[PDB]
């Protein structure tokens, strides 16, 4: 038989997904809201100083035009700012599919559902 069980919102209406980039990992909690984001309990502008990192996090929500329709509680560890910001980007895209599985094709086409494989390679 198959090893896939339909993903569903939890008891509190939250979609939980994990993402990875380089050595960084991110576990995000997406719920229906008004666009509030928290990174490790801190404001987005505090945790991520680079605006390009902030724009990376917002991209999946911008593809489905739902930037003001969800509250995101992102927890990230490992690597640096770029790895964490893009690991959060990847995790938000994977968590948004539960709210509307019809938008997976648009998320895949935008490139946010693909795990970036590149990592530091020991010179050979």
């Amino acid at each position: 038989s198959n090893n896939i069980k339909i993903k569903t919102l939890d008891e509190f209406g939250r979609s939980i997904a994990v993402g990875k980039r380089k050595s960084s990992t991110a576990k995000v909690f997406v719920v229906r809201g008004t666009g509030e984001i928290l990174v490790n309990g801190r404001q987005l502008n505090d945790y991520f100083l680079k605006m390009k990192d902030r724009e990376s996090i917002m991209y999946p929500l911008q593809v489905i035009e739902s930037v003001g329709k969800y509250n995101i509680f992102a927890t990230t560890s490992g690597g640096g700012p770029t790895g964490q910001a893009e690991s959060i980007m990847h995790a938000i895209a994977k968590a948004l599919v539960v709210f509307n599985p019809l938008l997976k094709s648009r998320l895949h086409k935008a490139g946010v559902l693909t795990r970036d494989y590149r990592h530091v390679e020991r010179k050979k």
Partner: protein
């Protein structure tokens, strides 16, 4: 020379501040700031009055790195949760001693400028210390006064006294007749060699005359003590004493100045430090009951346990090194009953108002106006700014070309 009369030779931050780049901005007609009619301007972008702009420029209310050059004159959003809330406490609270806090770029300086605008309208005398670092960095002269037992800074005091004279209404200053007779050494280059001293008799001369006394650098500390004493004894005019970037004072206990033993001089051994902390602690009491003391921190300064402990946000830890905890400043702040007012972040509706003003000022890029729905822009800019940070909002709109 390589530099011509109009060449832009400074760095970017100073060029934007000093290059007069607002001249090309489009004149917009906005309502005027008036706290007595806040109901008509609440949650709307307003310009200041002509009388307020003149006073606030002489006080140093407007600072660099505030994107003021984008608009003809500096503008402010009259907020309900920040501007209206703070000004109502200032008019009602009996103590009237506040310290404005909040995250870097939240709008603490703008709130202080709106409190200065209120004071100008409400016939008050404003004494502002915009950049306390100027008297703590050791880049101006200092001298020891034996009669005051303090280190006076003549160069700084000359600038400060002129700001108090040029920023405040002469009529208010003239109303305060002097309570004591004062004698100073004459430094006026016209009659200095004829009149050894200039006398200010009581009940005849006013505090306006005292602020125009040209004295020698060694007697300028005694002129600053007279001005403060005269303003603290009179009960006619309220005195609003303000200090921006007060975090610098709390975290720099020892100035860069060194005494004759090569020992750094404690900040409270300077007249500016002693005077500032005397007004905050309550040692210098003002007769008028509408006098206030509004302090504001800045995110450009380092943080430590001094301010949090003084505000009651954390317990006192006795084993914290003095470089991260100054118990004397905590005692002074708690003696003055200074209360905290945290500037809240902007809500999405306030972001909408600011972005609607920016569209009318023609400061928005073509990628945010053409092919983008207005609701999408507001949601995106509310997300990219950290959910309300005014400075991150402006940067996302005018300083993000990616």
């Amino acid at each position: 020379k390589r530099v011509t009369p109009g060449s832009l030779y400074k760095n970017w931050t100073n060029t934007t501040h000093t290059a007069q780049l607002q001249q090309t901005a489009v004149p917009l007609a906005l309502p005027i700031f008036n706290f007595d009619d806040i109901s008509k301007t609440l949650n709307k972008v307003v310009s200041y009055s002509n009388k307020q702009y003149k006073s606030l420029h002489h006080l140093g209310s407007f600072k660099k790195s505030q994107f003021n050059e984008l608009f003809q004159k500096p503008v402010c959003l009259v907020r309900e949760d920040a501007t209206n809330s703070f000004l109502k406490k200032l008019v009602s609270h009996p103590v009237k001693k506040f310290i404005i806090t909040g995250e870097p770029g939240v709008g603490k300086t703008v709130l202080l400028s709106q409190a200065h605008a209120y004071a100008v309208d409400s016939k008050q005398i404003i004494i502002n210390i915009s950049y306390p670092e100027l008297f703590l960095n050791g880049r101006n002269d200092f001298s020891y006064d034996d009669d005051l037992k303090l280190f006076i800074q003549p160069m700084y005091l000359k600038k400060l006294i002129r700001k108090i004279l040029k920023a405040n209404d002469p009529a208010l200053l003239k109303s305060i007749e002097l309570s004591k007779d004062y004698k100073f050494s004459n430094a006026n280059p016209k009659n200095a060699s004829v009149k050894p001293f200039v006398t200010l008799n009581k009940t005849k001369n006013t505090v306006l005359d005292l602020l125009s006394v040209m004295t020698h650098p060694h007697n300028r500390g005694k002129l600053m003590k007279a001005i403060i004493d005269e303003l603290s004894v009179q009960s006619k005019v309220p005195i609003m004493f303000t200090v921006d970037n007060f975090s610098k004072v709390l975290t720099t206990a020892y100035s860069a100045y060194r005494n004759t033993e090569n020992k750094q001089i404690y900040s409270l051994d300077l007249q500016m430090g002693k005077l500032m902390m005397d007004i905050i602690s309550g040692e210098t009491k003002f007769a008028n009951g509408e006098s206030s003391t509004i302090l504001a921190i800045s995110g450009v300064d380092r943080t430590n346990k001094t301010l949090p402990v003084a505000l009651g946000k954390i317990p006192v830890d006795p084993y914290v090194t003095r470089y991260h905890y100054e118990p004397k400043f905590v005692e002074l702040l708690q003696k003055g009953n200074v209360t905290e007012f945290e500037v809240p972040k902007l809500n999405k509706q306030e972001v909408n108002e600011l972005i609607d003003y920016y569209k009318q000022s023609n400061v928005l890029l073509d990628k945010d106006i053409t092919g983008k729905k207005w609701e999408n822009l507001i949601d995106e800019k509310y997300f990219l700014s950290g959910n309300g940070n005014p400075r991150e909002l402006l940067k996302s709109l005018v300083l993000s070309h990616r």
